[PDB]
Design a protein around this ligand. Structure first.
Ligand SMILES: Cc1cc(S(=O)(=O)N(Cc2ccc(CN)cc2)[C@H](C)C(=O)NO)ccc1F
Ligand SMILES: [Zn+2]
Length: 515
């Protein structure tokens, strides 16, 4: 055994001059990176009108279809403060109406929350870096805050000037404990076996290992000099080897902060045992970011050439985009091949071809990303207003004729990423149908005389989320009609006959469009 405390001491000495040279502005900066600054709950609540308090008190927050997971969590802690001023029956009653309460929000509820989200952003450098993938000019937060982020990130980059060096880099390992849900909320919930939680589901594991070949860090990784025993939710244990010129800084209690924008090549992925629980070891080696970007671009070129051919498109149509910057990079890239495969397997070749030609005619894109959708230009160039921007698993944006699919998050009511894609392709089918109906006044076919009536009657029969509005109802019905599960296709035909009819009609109408 090679001594944890001597390893520590030697890395501390390597950075001792650097540490002692830090101004205390420098020190403040590093602590702020480590410990984000949260919103002041009191002030938020103090600023609500009495009518807004009453609303926030009674509102069900997971009914939202646009808030991030971070925003959703904060709001719930905010509901609590609001509520601790009540009777025990009030509190119990208000929680009593929560069981059969999967329903869509009222319009005055949604409008309120959409504006409230501008006021509950933490100031959190590493989160801002990961969310935007390093592209911090993205107009998804207030301009003034955005500029404060830029100054801080620039100053941190300038503090991290000293590399680990030629002597240390192949003598030490660095460690990082991770929650599986921070890479894939989908595989996360089902990689710990259900029979036994101390075991790893070998099938999912082979899937995860399958193309986990590279990884990108767009923020500043905090790593441990010595391995720390896992917490509850920490089933991923990274062991990282740096490169000689990897720049880093010493943090107290045996940590290193690494420079942003590095690449990691996955060298090995194993199941290992640590006190009768199973964990996943991930061995990784720091490489230059550009190397991995080169691999991403070649994959993008190759998936487009493959799909340009299969779709009867010009050879150099830029159709599929990899917008990839985060720790599960290579899976995003590989997952897109499989998603597009399930798409061609479950939808008529003529429908797919005629609609995708329409998207390409409007300079459209299939964007596969691991940054948040508000930070994708296919959304933000057409949605100036932050209160109108959407976080979700998937989005169709008609103004840019693009489908956006966010890899890392897990969609409610979804079995996988392929299902999510097909629902988005449902919005695009709705778009083209409305255009064919009326080529100058290009509107959505769900905004038509007919379909509104159909929705007013059958709008409650299918999925809970189908009850939101005409657009979503259509999209869900379209998704269920092309499910791999046979039973799903028929429940639509039986529980909502007119919609079934109406969609199959539009599909006919589209395929029957020509030269
Ligand atoms: C069920 C489902 C969800 C999504 S989604 O999660 O990506 N999504 C909506 C959303 C629904 C439900 C909830 C919480 N119950 C939150 C958000 C977005 C806005 C959407 O309508 N894109 O067209 C995509 C495909 C799906 F089949
Ligand atoms: Zn939708």
């Amino acid at each position: 055994a090679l001594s944890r405390y001597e390893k520590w001491e030697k890395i501390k000495q390597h950075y001792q001059h650097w540490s002692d040279s830090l101004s205390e502005e420098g020190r403040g900066l590093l602590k702020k990176l480590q410990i984000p600054i949260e919103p002041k709950k009191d002030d938020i609540i103090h600023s609500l009108s009495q009518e807004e308090k009453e609303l926030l008190k009674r509102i069900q927050i997971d009914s939202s279809d646009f808030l991030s997971t971070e925003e959703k969590e904060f709001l719930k802690k905010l509901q609590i403060d609001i509520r601790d001023s009540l009777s025990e029956e009030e509190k119990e009653l208000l929680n009593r109406i929560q069981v059969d309460s999967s329903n869509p929000l009222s319009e005055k509820e949604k409008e309120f929350l959409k504006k409230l989200k501008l006021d509950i952003q933490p100031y959190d450098i590493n989160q801002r870096l990961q969310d935007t993938g390093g592209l911090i000019d993205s107009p998804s937060i207030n301009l003034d805050v955005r500029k404060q982020y830029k100054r801080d990130i620039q100053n941190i980059d300038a503090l991290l000037h000293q590399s680990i060096g030629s002597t240390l880099y192949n003598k030490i390992y660095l460690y990082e404990n991770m929650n599986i849900n921070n890479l894939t909320a989908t595989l996360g919930a089902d990689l710990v076996d259900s029979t036994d939680n101390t075991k790893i589901n070998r099938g999912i594991f082979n899937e995860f290992k399958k193309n986990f070949k590279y990884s990108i860090s767009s923020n500043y990784m905090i790593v441990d000099i010595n391995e720390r025993p896992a917490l509850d939710n920490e089933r991923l244990k990274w062991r990282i080897q740096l490169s000689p010129d990897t720049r880093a800084g010493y943090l107290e209690n045996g940590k290193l902060i690494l420079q942003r924008n590095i690449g990691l090549e996955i060298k090995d992925v194993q199941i290992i045992k640590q006190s009768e629980k199973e964990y996943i070891r991930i061995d990784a080696k720091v490489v230059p970011k550009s190397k991995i970007d080169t691999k991403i671009q070649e994959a993008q070129l190759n998936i487009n050439q493959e799909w340009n051919k299969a779709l009867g498109l010009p050879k150099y149509t830029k159709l599929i985009t990899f917008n990839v910057h985060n720790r599960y990079a290579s899976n995003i890239v590989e997952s897109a091949y499989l998603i597009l495969n399930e798409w061609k397997n479950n939808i008529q070749s003529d429908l797919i071809k005629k609609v995708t030609n329409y998207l390409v005619d409007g300079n459209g894109r299939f964007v596969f990303t691991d940054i948040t959708l508000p930070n994708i230009a296919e959304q933000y160039t057409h949605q100036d207003e932050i209160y109108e921007q959407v976080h979700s698993k998937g989005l169709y944006v008609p103004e840019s004729r693009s489908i956006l699919l966010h890899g890392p998050s897990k969609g409610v009511e979804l079995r996988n990423d392929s299902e999510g894609f097909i629902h988005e392709f449902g919005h695009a089918v709705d778009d083209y149908a409305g255009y064919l109906l009326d080529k100058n006044q290009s509107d959505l076919v769900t905004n038509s005389k007919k379909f509104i009536d159909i929705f007013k009657e059958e709008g409650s029969n299918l999925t809970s989320y189908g009850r939101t509005n005409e657009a979503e109802f259509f999209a869900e019905a379209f998704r269920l009609m092309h499910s791999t599960d046979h039973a799903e296709r028929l429940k639509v035909q039986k529980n909502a006959p007119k919609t079934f009819q109406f969609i199959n009609d539009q599909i006919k109408f589209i395929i029957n469009s020509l030269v």
